[PDB]
Design a binder for this molecule. Structure first.
Ligand SMILES: [Cl-]
Ligand SMILES: [Cl-]
Ligand SMILES: [Cl-]
Ligand SMILES: [Cl-]
Ligand SMILES: [Cl-]
Ligand SMILES: [Cl-]
Ligand SMILES: [Cl-]
Ligand SMILES: [Cl-]
Ligand SMILES: [Cl-]
Ligand SMILES: [Cl-]
Ligand SMILES: [Cl-]
Ligand SMILES: [Cl-]
Lengths: 114, 114, 114
């Protein structure tokens, strides 16, 4: 799976280890070995949410399976909790788009998972 | 909805209130409340369009509904117009990918919109 | 088509002409004129793959058609090979998401390809 977070919070505010925490937490949440989890954090972004420049985050979670109505409502709680505590971002200023990818459309190690 | 623009244009070229203008313009075009409209601008990017490094932009508009053939043509005219006027990017060097998201795949404030 | 690569490799490690090679190689690979190919490289990113901060990359290839089972495997071998040879990134530390876009969902030059 892949989790990406874009935020206007400054780099100095992203704790070292936030990537590893996300990796471990998502591995448990998606029931997959942490080795398959990739995380990407992009701070100091020029963004607005509701026309306001207060801390916010635009994120995405891509995974081959393990995505759905119920699982997604669950991930939102996990991720908003992490963004709230580690990045000081209010939960109502967080968007997380979920993508259930076909193995044929995920390239890795010179091939695809199909 | 969420609008993101990645461009090689320098940060300094981004006029003040640009994020607010995008928010306001998209509120009108999509008919959705500005309170839930997110905008993200990423300048100084290393990119090429047609192999050329002249001003260009790669954008995306995600929305739950309000996406379609006719509406997308209208959004493109609006957004390309804004990029040309405000960022001095020629419309023929702009790509905008549109995404109609299922409510169940849009996470926000510890849940999804489904 | 559009190819995006996000990586933790430093900007100074990207060889001169990398965007040109991608443009040229992707045009050949997808069969589309290089004029229609856009490339975006984002180095110095804060990311991890498998909980490791070693060189890695998260990429995406969007195209109207020219995407499928066999084609994606071919694109992956091509792209992972380039990232390995030019950026020194191990192929098993690269993810490439493929997207077959509907023409109506791709804006350009004040309109859409629909
Ligand atoms: Cl996955
Ligand atoms: Cl820290
Ligand atoms: Cl589910
Ligand atoms: Cl897919
Ligand atoms: Cl494989
Ligand atoms: Cl929406
Ligand atoms: Cl969706
Ligand atoms: Cl295309
Ligand atoms: Cl280059
Ligand atoms: Cl194919
Ligand atoms: Cl093929
Ligand atoms: Cl599409």
């Amino acid at each position: 799976p892949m989790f990406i977070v874009n935020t206007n919070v400054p780099r100095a505010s992203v704790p070292d280890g936030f990537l590893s925490e996300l990796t471990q937490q998502l591995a448990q949440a998606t029931g997959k070995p942490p080795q398959y989890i990739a995380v990407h954090v992009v701070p100091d972004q020029l963004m607005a949410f509701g026309g306001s420049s207060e801390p916010c985050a635009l994120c995405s979670l891509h995974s081959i399976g393990k995505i759905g109505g119920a699982q997604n409502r669950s991930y939102s709680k996990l991720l908003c909790g992490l963004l709230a505590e580690r990045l000081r971002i209010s939960p109502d200023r967080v968007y997380i788009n979920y993508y259930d990818m076909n193995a044929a459309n995920v390239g890795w190690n010179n091939s695809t998972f199909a």
